[PDB]
């Protein structure tokens, strides 16, 4: 479509609206010019959801306990307040880990202080002092506690930081309050800020006077990598086969330990920029550690990527970068041969969170697909601003896209392949289009490095070109 | 590494010798791990007697529960409703949980809307949210009614959803007539089932409340069914087959069954049949109610019975056989129809299945959990299969269901050795199992990690699971079936018989050690 | 020993102690058994390719045949008409096994009898013994019909049918009138699918040949349906349920699903339901005949083409999508009835299903086997799914039937590393699970000993069964499923799906080893 | 029920047969007279059955191939003929054993010749010897093999002996010609004669000349026990811990070479005399070895037997059987406290094959059930002469009852309990009477000996008094 017939569709789509809703959405939907560095011309975003338009977005909590705290394996986190919040989140989201679950690894299960009425009307400070008791005597490996705050906490006035400093201090134990009430914010972002500042007031100092710890040139931390079906290890692998040595990995398969070490690395390898770029920031300015951007999406990407990550070290991080680069190109060659052919020019439209609607773009081009509509539930105006330079011109872009404009978007546009969420799935499926998870890639991956290459051009091909999809009309009509 | 023409995902690619060797250093250099024995004590510990009494002695802690929140029942009766869009007033987070709860259940699409309340709705109130809510709804979505529930938040700071849907009308927001019927429905009171009771006692009121002077009592020759929080297809469907044919008049007040089960034919339905307002608005003619869940059904019941005057029939969920024949018996009493010949012959197929399979389900220990009317019928249906129901275990159950689950038990001595515990989760169920270690498990998708510790104990301690209830997330299409009537207690008898043979396979399918036993024919 | 509260049957019982010791010194004492080395040596051996290469050399030698003989057909036939007693003329023995294998199927009485021809009608003929078993059998049984069928016995001896039943009725045995169709069914040609469609043409023959002049084809507005040897009750009902829901007028030519499935309710029915004799004598009345299982029932057609002069149309078994389809719409022109919306909607509900679960199914490799359209029907479904059927057995096939299969594997990339095996058994095919190892076996209970076989080279090496076909012998109540039309195609989706899933969940159960990929939701 | 009742039960049901048949019929049914020595005064038995009766006996094949031979471990046994025969048998009676099967052990295997026509045409031979260079290559490790004719060879006059005698010595192997077509006598019986006839031939003199076996004075042999369930294992370890030394098992879980060191035991224990009474008595005659019955069902019996085995040898076996008897008293008084209470006064009708319609009477009574009658299927008279004095006075007895005949019985004797085969199982289940299985035992077992007690018992209770029986009629009628 030309970039007027894009237009055009957007206020087609428009003219539903009650006219207050209207206004406010046209300010969210945008035809990219490649050309734009400054997003904030174009298009708006981190703004209230517009009430009774089926936001995909979710709340605070999903981004601190969902996200950021739930991954932490060796710690226990408890969902505070009634009992939906952590039922629904329990073992949703794939961020795998190394353990023994109940005894000294925790993610998977659901912790919570399961208020009732009582809790509401005379407050859960009391309820929350004896729930932790009986956490450190049926759970005496947890090496620490988080409190991640639902709804009504702050509604009722809880006072859940007193209760972490004076059972933290009873117990010598790490108690962490987080504040990621689902009234805070306007979606998943909010909680990873209060996630990453809970991280950086109550756990990251806590071996700042401590030089017990043997530091070498090449120690790095992978930051913002949830480990979704493994995708920080085969990230990991690469670093260290280049040389380098990774002291942690916040928060896939993250240990409490690792993260208090993590002041004590020479260099932070930012993947996820939307929800860790805050305590990347800080650990520059407190520790002064350096931190770098980077995307291990595909061979083009991860290989610009080791490339310069190794630059900032010396000649045998160099030396070993090449290497690596050289041990993997046929196999990421021989996936490329396999499946290229069989995607050559498929069109895709994506709709994900913070990251991955810009992050996979060079992936599905290293399979010869297109990206032709994409945009982000939740995402700021520095993520768009680094969106607009890795999508084409005329390609159609969305912030915080309702279910109305989604559909509609898709009818116009008709992509080969949709990748976003469960809520979507189902819906474009009926529509006989192709769809993949880009959230929990769809119970497959990791997606991340060489390895992960593999598994997603396999998991695109198989979908794309499923035999289902010649199927949808009966052949009597 | 991946060999290219066979590619690895995580399982197995992360065993690996290269990616082993790597986790092997993550943990010594940077995750200080406690010691692998202090680990296997650890353990160990869990699964005893003493650390059970520990378990049990919680009051404030609780570990993998087995219950969900209000509004989550609230939006399954709401989706019951012909072109009906379930909105929860309160905050966004919940209904995209909710939205997502239902998705992998029933791998279909759940339409819900939120009206968005943030911190500044958290001091003034939500009543700007339910003004532009109501009306970008009606106008984006085309619904034909809107029912309206809440999350926590709203409720924390008392919101009056019936002065905001009042002022919203008013206004002008949504025109005076289009439908708006509502309920309260917090976080931290029951649970999700009392979502569902309040929500459609809240739509039962809004279509009847103020017209029940021209109503006469039968004058429809209908029986209305409230099949309660019920995430089965094949029980909505079997209730509808077994009353049609004995040509029953009927009306299922909140069927979801066409909205959770659209074809894939090339279009998205946002909305599919439902019960209708016409439907709701003539209730009251019907000559009775019949509630097929009644332990959630207690606000609706108290409804049905004072303002219909419907005499609502005291009948058990129509689970196993004797519930069956009673739900059937009573419906031929209230409609002046005979059991018809077709569902006489199909309780004597059932009856024959359970002659053909007593042998093997003589005697089988059974841990299972679930909502209340769920679990009871569970319950009336294994000790009909000459089973024992040691653990019943129901975490949102109250004390005169467990009386009655008791009394239910006592009738039987199949009952001895069983306990219902209320208020209790996974974990003190996990206990349970460790314990008085049961032949298997019948519970939802939560119990598999259950399974998981058992193994670790040893083989010999493993309980497997039998998935029955909901959610089941990691199996396909298991939410077709059917668990109420004789259909229902065919697919469970199969199922658990099934269960028992193909445990007992593989416990003897050791060659020269165990298969002397392995037999063709069972 | 025992301990009374909890009494051990062989399994467990033998593996105590003392039991284990006795049998170690019942070994070694005197059973001068091969060294445990040397077994391992020769087990190791039978699963390499030079194994492979002198099995799949043998001419003479059958081992685990997958096929039955001609009368067991016959009988399944016989038992589908209306107050019908099968009778196979020669040696008991046979009618005992052929009893004994539909009752441990189906877990059913079945009614059948012998006229028991012993040493002297090995000499004289088995003349006395028709006449003597005819006059028995409709005075014990009171059947309406005797269908009257060969032991191989009776076929080597050269016992003349049609002459013997004559000379009965010319006696007096029993009277002229009275019904009693044949079909000379030999052991020794073909295999029970042959005996199902030599004992259909029989009757049919019985009932129309002499009567054909005053036949007007179409004149009773029916479509005749011809099941072939079916063992699933969910395929004639599916068949039936579907031609109702098009309000297509039929009759269903041999239908045992009543006499198969009676209930129990204090009384033993002999006989239920089945097709009527005035069915099959006003069956050239009919628009047209469709044969469900064509690769079975050729003499059958050639009889209803060439007396009845229906034009029987080309048609596949009704398996699968594309094959349903393909029925419904041959259906519909020949009644002229449209396809309905329900049908419509089921069908696209199946496309659903396969849209949920193709993730899980694609590039899944599979050995089957079973009869030829059983067979061929599961590979085009499963070529639909986008799995690979790798090795594809049909003990019973014919080269006539590989060709169509091997079109068919040809026409869908799924098919490229896909093999028909015809006149192999489960011997040979225990031989390609080794060598070319797939993810599942889909078959009946004998592949439970191939599954043993696999687990004991390792459990990396372990091939699951499925449990689809007959006999299913090990499982219960697994005949009262579907396998035609969609619902069939469902009902066999969820099996594959799931038994994936099961065995996924099997090899990520390892707590702290493979468990990080023990997904709550699949 | 009065002794005219039952008779007068009898002349009614024998009124719907034609008179042959009546006349025939009424021979083979009888009134008990517990004072009868010759029950040839009273019954007939082991004559052809009526055409077109629905008898439920089967063939010689079946008492040869899947009685007799079958169970023996490391021989292959090869079903000869067309497909039939050995697939209805495979794996349908559960003589248990140890072995690796395919390996060194072959009972749940089918080995067939799979007749076609052109074998029926010109003969089977040369496809015989063919078929064992088969068997020979692809089981090396097999002891031997059998021949089990089926229906056609002896009609087209093939000659397996001949291939047998030039086979054997060319591989010198032992290849046992069985010529138990089913066309040969009248039922199971004659193939159990044949089959022991066949063992006589060709197996049992093996070792007529090697010397080199070491013999001890209490040397026996079980005879006749099938290990149906695991039956002869839980028998053999009573036999040892009285200080005997089973040297061999025919024919459950049972090897060539038990069968071939059997003429060196002092003493042959028949449990099933109707099958193996033919070889016990060549034994006796050839050898010099005394053989006796014995009964292994139920305590009672169970410890009869093992005074009266032990009393054959000396005062130390004697003494050790007295031990043995003490050792397990307290285990099946348990069984009975548990049990008999519940079984009290029921009331069982059996019909069985050639041994268990007398033999587990006992066992009944034990529980203190009552046997009100029970019959044969291929019984001689000499087995009708040792049942007369096991059963009680005016019971009904029937030897190769008719379908018809079974069932009247059945409505008017009304047992609480029958035990029988498969083909009777599910028509009495749906007429409200609880069946157990007393062939295969209901997948269950075992049932000899003192742990088998118990798990008849247990079986026997959870089946009469299952709640399902309750049932059956529906609430509305
Ligand atoms: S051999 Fe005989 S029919 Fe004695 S042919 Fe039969 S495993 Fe029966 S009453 Mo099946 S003379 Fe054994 C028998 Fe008894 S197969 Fe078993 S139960 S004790
Ligand atoms: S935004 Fe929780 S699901 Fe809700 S109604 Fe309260 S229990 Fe239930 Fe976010 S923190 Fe949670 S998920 Fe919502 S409530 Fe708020
Ligand atoms: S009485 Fe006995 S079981 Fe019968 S045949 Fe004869 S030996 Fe055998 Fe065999 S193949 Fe089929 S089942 Fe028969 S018709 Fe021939
Ligand atoms: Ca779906
Ligand atoms: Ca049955």
């Not at chain 1, 404009?405 to 809520?423: A, W």
Request: proline share 5%; with cysteine.
């Amino acid at each position: 479509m030309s970039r007027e017939e894009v237009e055009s569709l957007i206020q087609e789509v428009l003219e539903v609206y009650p006219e207050k809703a209207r206004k406010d959405r046209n300010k969210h939907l945008a035809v990219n010019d490649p050309a734009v560095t400054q997003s904030k011309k174009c298009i708006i975003s981190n703004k209230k959801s517009q009430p009774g338009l089926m936001t995909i977005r979710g709340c605070a909590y999903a981004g601190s306990k969902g996200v950021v705290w739930g991954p932490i394996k060796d710690m226990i986190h408890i969902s505070h307040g009634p009992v939906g919040c952590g039922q629904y989140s329990r073992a949703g989201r794939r961020n795998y880990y190394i353990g023994t679950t109940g005894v000294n690894a925790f993610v998977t299960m659901n912790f919570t202080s399961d208020f009732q009425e009582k809790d509401i009307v005379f407050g859960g400070d009391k309820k929350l002092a004896k729930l932790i008791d009986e956490v450190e005597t049926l759970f005496p490996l947890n090496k620490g506690i988080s409190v991640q705050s639902e709804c009504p906490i702050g509604l009722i006035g809880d006072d859940i930081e007193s209760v972490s400093k004076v059972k933290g201090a009873e117990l010598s134990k790490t108690i962490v309050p987080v504040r990621c009430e689902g009234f805070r914010g306007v979606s998943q972002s909010l909680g990873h800020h209060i996630a990453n500042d809970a991280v950086r007031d109550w756990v990251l100092g806590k071996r700042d006077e401590d030089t017990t710890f043997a530091s070498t040139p090449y120690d790095v931390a992978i930051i913002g990598d949830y480990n979704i079906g493994g995708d920080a290890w085969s990230s990991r692998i690469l670093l260290e086969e280049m040389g380098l040595r990774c002291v942690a990995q916040w928060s896939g398969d993250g240990s409490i330990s690792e993260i208090e070490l993590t002041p004590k690395v020479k260099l932070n390898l930012v993947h996820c920029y939307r929800s860790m770029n805050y305590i990347s920031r800080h650990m520059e300015e407190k520790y002064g550690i350096p931190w770098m951007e980077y995307n291990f999406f595909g061979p083009t990407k991860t290989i610009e990527s080791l490339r310069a990550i190794a630059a900032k070290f010396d000649e045998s991080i160099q030396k070993k970068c090449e290497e690596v680069i050289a041990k993997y190109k046929p196999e990421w060659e021989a996936v490329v041969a396999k499946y290229r052919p069989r995607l050559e020019g498929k069109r895709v439209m994506l709709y994900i969170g913070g990251l991955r609607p810009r992050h996979v773009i060079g992936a599905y081009e290293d399979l010869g697909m297109e990206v032709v509509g994409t945009g982000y539930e939740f995402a700021h105006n520095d993520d768009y601003d680094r969106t607009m330079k890795e999508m084409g011109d005329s390609t159609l872009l969305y912030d915080d896209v309702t279910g109305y404009e989604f559909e509609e978007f898709v009818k116009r546009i008709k992509p080969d392949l949709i990748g976003s969420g469960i809520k979507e799935k189902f819906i474009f499926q009926k529509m006989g289009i192709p769809f993949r998870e880009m959230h929990s890639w769809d119970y497959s991956g990791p997606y991340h490095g060489f390895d992960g290459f593999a598994i997603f051009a396999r998991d695109m091909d198989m979908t794309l070109n499923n035999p289902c999809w010649k199927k949808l009309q009966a052949p009597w009509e | 590494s991946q060999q290219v023409d066979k590619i690895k995902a995580s399982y197995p690619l992360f065993l690996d010798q290269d990616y082993k060797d790597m986790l092997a250093k993550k943990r010594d250099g940077f995750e200080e791990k406690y010691p692998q024995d202090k680990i296997d004590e650890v353990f160990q510990w869990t699964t005893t007697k003493e650390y059970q009494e520990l378990n049990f002695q919680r009051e404030a802690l609780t570990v993998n529960p087995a219950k969900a929140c209000q509004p989550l029942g609230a939006v399954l009766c709401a989706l019951g409703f012909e072109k009906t869009m379930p909105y929860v007033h309160g905050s966004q987070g919940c209904v995209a949980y909710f939205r997502s709860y239902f998705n992998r259940h029933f791998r279909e699409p759940v339409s819900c809307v939120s009206d968005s309340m943030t911190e500044d709705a958290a001091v003034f109130g939500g009543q700007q949210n339910m003004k532009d809510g109501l009306q970008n709804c009606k106008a984006t979505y085309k619904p034909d009614m809107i029912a309206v529930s809440t999350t926590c938040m709203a409720e924390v700071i008392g919101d009056d959803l019936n002065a905001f849907i009042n002022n919203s009308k008013k206004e002008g927001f949504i025109p005076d007539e289009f439908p708006v019927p509502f309920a309260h429905t917090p976080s931290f009171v029951g649970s999700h089932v009392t979502g569902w009771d309040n929500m459609f006692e809240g739509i039962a009121r809004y279509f009847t409340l103020k017209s029940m002077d021209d109503k006469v009592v039968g004058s429809n020759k209908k029986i209305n069914i409230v099949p309660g929080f019920e995430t089965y297809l094949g029980n909505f469907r079997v209730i509808k087959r077994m009353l049609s044919e004995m040509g029953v008049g009927y009306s299922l007040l909140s069927d979801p069954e066409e909205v959770l089960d659209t074809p894939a034919d090339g279009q998205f339905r946002m909305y599919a049949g439902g019960t209708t307002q016409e439907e709701m608005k003539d209730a009251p003619n019907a000559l009775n109610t019949v509630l097929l869940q009644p332990w959630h059904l207690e606000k609706t019941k108290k409804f049905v019975e004072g303002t219909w005057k419907h005499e609502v029939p005291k009948l058990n969920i129509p689970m196993g056989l004797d519930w069956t024949d009673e739900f059937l018996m009573k419906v031929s009493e209230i409609s002046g129809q005979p059991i018809p010949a077709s569902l006489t012959k199909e309780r004597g197929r059932l009856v024959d299945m359970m002659t053909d399979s007593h042998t093997w389900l003589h005697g089988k220990r059974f841990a299972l959990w679930g909502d209340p009317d769920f679990v009871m019928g569970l319950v009336k249906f294994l000790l009909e299969l000459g089973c024992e129901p040691v653990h019943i275990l129901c975490h949102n159950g109250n004390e005169r269901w467990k009386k009655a689950v008791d009394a239910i038990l006592a009738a039987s001595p199949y009952g001895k050795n069983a306990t219902v515990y209320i208020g209790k989760d996974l974990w003190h169920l996990r206990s349970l199992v460790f314990t008085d270690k049961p032949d298997f498990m019948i519970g939802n998708s939560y119990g598999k990690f259950i399974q998981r510790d058992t193994l670790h104990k040893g083989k010999e301690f493993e309980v497997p699971l039998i998935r029955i209830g909901f959610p089941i997330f990691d199996r396909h299409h298991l939410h077709r079936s059917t668990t109420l009537g004789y259909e229902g207690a065919m697919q469970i008898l199969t199922t658990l018989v099934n269960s028992i043979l193909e445990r007992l396979d593989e416990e003897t399918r050791g060659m020269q050690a165990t298969d002397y036993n392995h037999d063709l024919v069972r």
